[model samples]
Target: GAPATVTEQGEDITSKKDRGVLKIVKRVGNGEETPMIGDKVYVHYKGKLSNGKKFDSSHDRNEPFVFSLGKGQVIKAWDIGVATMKKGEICHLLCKPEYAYGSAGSLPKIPSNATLFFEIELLDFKGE
Candidate 1:
């Protein structure tokens, strides 16, 4: 699940929307620093649908994401995804429909084929 702060850049979003892949910079993934499963964490994030429509955000809500990793509490992918992130790390995650709301859609705001954007901050992870 990608945070809204994904900046509406990259081939992940633009390509799906017919904008083509346009990542301006190189991504630093688990190879450099990343999160793993079963880690409690905090993240300041934003959300965007594949069409580049801004939806939700920690900046907007004035809050951050705090949860237990690898727990079924959140979306399935997120449980595993956050584990691959690291503290104070910011990343752009692009989620396909299945990882997102599925074909039914989350609601009126999310569309069926919507890919998600997330700029995540791995604020803190507890234990290993």
Candidate 2:
């Protein structure tokens, strides 16, 4: 069966350029506020390949990854997708090469031009 492209709010939020990236909300967040650019956002994520092989997991480490939102610290899909998330929200991001590791890839864990999937939870954020 084809997976639905709609979010939890029943709408498509795919960007025009990065069409390969899809943000599917699994659980809504606690508040209405979303992270802003330069805000220090904390998240827990599990990354997998297209074949469902797990590459990384923040939950396994028992520590949330922290980065500034929209700061280019992570992949493009993450900056875009995480910016749209609210605190405590969980979503799955389907990312293509352009929005992920691209042709260079991520070394041993990810291959060149490989698509990646990530289950990300927005734990919290603080303004810079």
Candidate 3:
């Protein structure tokens, strides 16, 4: 096998557009939803930044997460995004800076206004 290649090319808006499209496709492939307020959800996920830094992962800890959609517990994007999903489905939630932390970053790994990516799998749900 050949050695892996490393490149520092600038981000292509077009590729970002494609990835954005894939983000939707992942949702479609897994039959997830854009949930509504007061809905409960179970999800396994990993977070990543635009610079490709790993953030957090439920899988790494062998756990699935449960949260109430549209509740005040998490950040706005998470609360909004997971609401659209259902049980046993997988999807990607793409969060740009404003959708995420905006002027202030999450911490350590995330920088201000950095776009974030999350690979999310909906494991189950409770009453709406």
Which prediction has the highest lDDT against the true structure?
A: 2
The better-scoring model by TM-score among 1 and 3 is 3
lDDT, residue 28, model 3: 45
Tell me the tens digit of each residue's lDDT in model 1 across 4-93. 333355443332353322222223543355546666777777677756687888888779888878777776446545666556566666
List lDDT for all candidates, in order: 0.60, 0.82, 0.61
C-alpha RMSD (angstroms) for model 3: 6.7
TM-score for all models, in order of appearance: 0.68, 0.88, 0.70
| lDDT score for residue 32 of model 1 | 56
lDDT of each residue in 1-128, candidate 3, tens digit only: 00001012212122334322114324443444444577677789888775567789999989988888777677665775666556555656666666677779967878888777777887776777
**Model 2, span 1-128: residue lDDT tens:** 11233222223345675456777778999969899999999999998886678899998879999999988999988998899899989988777788899999989999999878788999999998
Clashes of each: 18, 0, 6
Deviating ranges (above 4 Å) for candidate 1? 1-36
Model 2 clash pairs are: none
- Looking at model 2, residue 98 earns an lDDT score of 86
Candidate 1's error at 102, in angstroms? 0.5
Model 3 CA lDDT for position 66: 81
